[PDB]
Design a binder for these strands. Sequence first.
RNA 1: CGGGGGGAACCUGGGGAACUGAAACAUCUCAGUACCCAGAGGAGAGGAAAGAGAAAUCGACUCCCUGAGUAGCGGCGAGCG
RNA 2: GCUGUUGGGAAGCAGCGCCAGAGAGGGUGAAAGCCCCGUAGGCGAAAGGUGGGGGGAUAGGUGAGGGUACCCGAGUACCCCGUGGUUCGUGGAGCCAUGGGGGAAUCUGGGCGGACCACCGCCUAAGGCUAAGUACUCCGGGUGACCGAUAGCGCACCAGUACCGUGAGGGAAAGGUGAAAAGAACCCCGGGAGGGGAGUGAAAUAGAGCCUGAAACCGUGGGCUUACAAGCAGUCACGGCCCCAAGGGGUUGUGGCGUGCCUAUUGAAGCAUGAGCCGGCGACUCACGGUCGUGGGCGAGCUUAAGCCGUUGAGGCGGAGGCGUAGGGAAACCGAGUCCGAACAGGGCGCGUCCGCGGCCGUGGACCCGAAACCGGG
RNA 3: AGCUGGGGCUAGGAGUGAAAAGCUAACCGAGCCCGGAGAUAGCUGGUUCUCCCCGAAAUGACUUUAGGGUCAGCCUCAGGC
RNA 4: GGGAUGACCCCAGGCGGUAGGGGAGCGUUCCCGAUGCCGAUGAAGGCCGACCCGCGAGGGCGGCUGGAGGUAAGGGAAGUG
RNA 5: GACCCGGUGAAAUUGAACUGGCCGUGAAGAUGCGGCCUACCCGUGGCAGGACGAAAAGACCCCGUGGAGCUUUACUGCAGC
Lengths: 100, 63, 146, 103
Amino acid sequence: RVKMHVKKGDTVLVASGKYKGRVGKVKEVLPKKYAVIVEGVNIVKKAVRVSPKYPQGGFIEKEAPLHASKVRPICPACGKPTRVRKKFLENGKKIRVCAK
Amino acid sequence: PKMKTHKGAKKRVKITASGKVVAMKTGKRHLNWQKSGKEIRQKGRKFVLAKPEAERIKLLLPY
Amino acid sequence: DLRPNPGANKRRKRVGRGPGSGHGKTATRGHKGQKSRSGGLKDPRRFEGGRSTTLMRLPKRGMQGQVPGEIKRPRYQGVNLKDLARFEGEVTPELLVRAGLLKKGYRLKILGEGEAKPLKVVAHAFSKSALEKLKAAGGEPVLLEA
Amino acid sequence: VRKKGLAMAVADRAREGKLLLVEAFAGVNGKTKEFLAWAKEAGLDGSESVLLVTGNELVRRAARNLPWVVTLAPEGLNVYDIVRTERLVMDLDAWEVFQNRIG
RNA sequence: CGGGGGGAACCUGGGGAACUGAAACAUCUCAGUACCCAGAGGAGAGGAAAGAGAAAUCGACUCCCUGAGUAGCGGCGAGCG
RNA sequence: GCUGUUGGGAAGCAGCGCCAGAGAGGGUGAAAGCCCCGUAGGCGAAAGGUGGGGGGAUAGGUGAGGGUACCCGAGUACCCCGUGGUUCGUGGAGCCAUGGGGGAAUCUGGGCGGACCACCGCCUAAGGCUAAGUACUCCGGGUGACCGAUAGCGCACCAGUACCGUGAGGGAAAGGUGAAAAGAACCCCGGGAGGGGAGUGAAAUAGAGCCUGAAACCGUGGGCUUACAAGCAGUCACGGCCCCAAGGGGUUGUGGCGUGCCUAUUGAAGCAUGAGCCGGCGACUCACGGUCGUGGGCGAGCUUAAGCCGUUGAGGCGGAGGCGUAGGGAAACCGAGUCCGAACAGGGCGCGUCCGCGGCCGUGGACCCGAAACCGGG
RNA sequence: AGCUGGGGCUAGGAGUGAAAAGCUAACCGAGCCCGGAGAUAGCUGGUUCUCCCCGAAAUGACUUUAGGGUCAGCCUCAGGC
RNA sequence: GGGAUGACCCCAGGCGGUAGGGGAGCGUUCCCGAUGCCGAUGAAGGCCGACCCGCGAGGGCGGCUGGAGGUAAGGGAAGUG
RNA sequence: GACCCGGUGAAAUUGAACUGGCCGUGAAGAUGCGGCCUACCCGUGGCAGGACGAAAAGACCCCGUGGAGCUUUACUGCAGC
């Protein structure tokens, strides 16, 4: 709803910036931010556990957002923008020379 | 926004084909009683000079 | 043609006059030095002194107009047979409006300068002169109107 | 003064050797593809900018989206659009109306 | 059955100023403007001739362009029109 | 639409492609027709609004002669008094309207055509309804030789707020980290506030009213310099010391010269006005007429307005009209003449337009700021 | 002819007033707010970059004029002689 | 005056200046030029400069900052110093 | 209270100041021109001769065809009678 875009929880290839060429699963989508997730962008956040119950929370720290225009879905073949087919009854998305 | 002609002059002074400004001689509408035949006669029209440039500018539409 | 320098020729001059600087039209603004160059002044044309303009001159141009306004009366337009020389065949009002003179100006009267021409020429009147010159072949369509 | 300008504008362009009025348009069903091909044969390489006038709406759709070509109905003929362009191409029916617009 | 109250402007009607301009000022001007009241609506007003006005003329009303700063009005001033 | 290349980051640069009725525009780590949202082009409403535009269906409307003369809107017409409206200001003052008095007729009726009479003509008052073409912008949308946070609305920000006033009413200020919060764990000094390390980041003199960070203003360090000289503070000359080099830069010891700026004035260093200083805001314009000049187009002609069609930053059409081609005379009028006049005396007046630009003028505040006051409604 | 609490009424050319033109919400010879309104101001002040050429006047006439103006005089630009 | 008009060279005058008149420029915002060209090998803006061009208004160039915009020649418009 | 110490800390005013005396001069009342005399640099507690010291665009005075209050056998009107 004005929010909507390209992909959902699935395998997508990044073409981004730093993580250019990357192939990652489920993008865990926003779309408030038009952002996604993959295993692309990663950083360290500093911590001491929300409650020092199990002391430190840890230190590896997880994935940044990443603009949804950076990713590009994929199937039998590569990237491909999505196209949208009638189906004769409902409506699904098929990739250019492909399906789903 | 569009100039109006100044009726008080239109009403009392002709504009010639040169573009000179023509006015009647003043000075014989009641004065008389006995001024010479020369006086009272010598009132037909006349020119003016430098003061007509002014009088013309007010008869602006009639040219 | 090229793109630049179609450029205005010789003299366009859009350089009008601003008055603000140390050099040019300074301080008091390109004129003025005094009081009554300040946001209005009385005329002149007609005005001033508080003398009497010259509205000491006098409106002998009498016959200035009565209440219900003008009197409609048929109005006449001059045209010289000189001007007629141009065209041949037969000349009539409206035939003339579709040219330099008369136009809408109602009742045609041919008169005056130039030599006359062999053509019948409808008019509401002539000068004596122009009636005589037009003896050299040409018309007395006069009368007209109803 | 507008007639004059319009007449002259073309003339400068004629003198330049740029005015080419045509007839052939097998470049139909206004596809950019089709026009372009046709253009190639007419030596319109896209190395200079071009003003195309014609009443045929399919050739109009044909160019348009080309960025070196300015497309135009003939009643829209006008000096600015003429001048801004480097080369001038007219339908003969367009050249017919241009005739009428002067004398 | 209706009414009532509201609504940015816009409209019609009932009332209706002054600074100002006139190089003072009273007639005149600003101006039937500002403002107050009542009413109308998506508009309002107007509208089918007891009209115009000089044309064997035209043919409801409204709005635009002309006509025209003309016709005239005017302490024949300023100005109005 | 892929690859390669620099870069934190490509959309840059390079190689080789493709789409185009789509090369409007925004975004994506920078500058992308082909990544995203879009654009061209084309689809779509069960529901509730709208809807003669296209249909239907009603209401409704559909004659001649020849006779009678029964009806054709009343305190009305009409006249007078007092006023209003119209361009009309008592004018020669009609017409339209009406507070007061008097007060008809039904087509031989009655109003009008600018006092009034007479012809000639126009129209049928005293009952009512009528779309459309017109105005306006709370609201939705589209555009911009419109603004870009002292601008643009008063308000980009939780503003008609805070605040002020009994009240009517008055009325501000205040935007910006970064691509991503990755917004700085943990250690150190400290009560904290703040620092210092560590750490993130391409960048932290991007560290959180955080982009850029000018000036006034306040510091710290360094060079030259000053405690027997007198000054609008500078300047000309020499000389010394300090800094990269036969040339500069800084500073200033002694010598010569020297009455701040603006305004207003006959006259100002003036003991006449203004000004603490710095930054921003801050004043000769635009519309329509006019009149000179100038760049052009056409020329005894020139030119179109409103509109109509076309465009979707395209131009056409439209001669109603406007100036000019003829002047004189108050006019009737006459006309290259005409006016006064008895006058074949005299004498007076008697040969472009359209668009652009600039100077100036008239009307609107009309170069900007400022009254004491007057009026209306609260 | 006392003071004072609470509840009322009277207003802007109007109120109130043992009277001063006193009071009427901290300035009353006519309140305050918003509006006409950017009133008008012949007065005072202010009017912003650069270079180049020329360069005045503080007289006369009239002026409900006299520190304002209109014409003339003196400056300047263009064309012409 | 030349006149291979060269706006380039000789010859002769002049060049204090307020109100004013005239003439040439500079710079700011925006428009066409632009589907273009400059820009991360660093835009606009800022801090220096004893350097270069201009009589001047100004214009370059060089270093530092800054971090994403800017915009020729030649024209056009104005909330322009 | 004023003075010294410790804590907090305004104001009008302000062109910039490197701000002496006399005799002169000057728009005729000079730190700032001329001549001469005097004077090491910087504070603090005191005084009020000067800076025509500050404050308020003079109340006086005149000027404006500025205003407003009041008067009358000024004018012209109106309410009232």
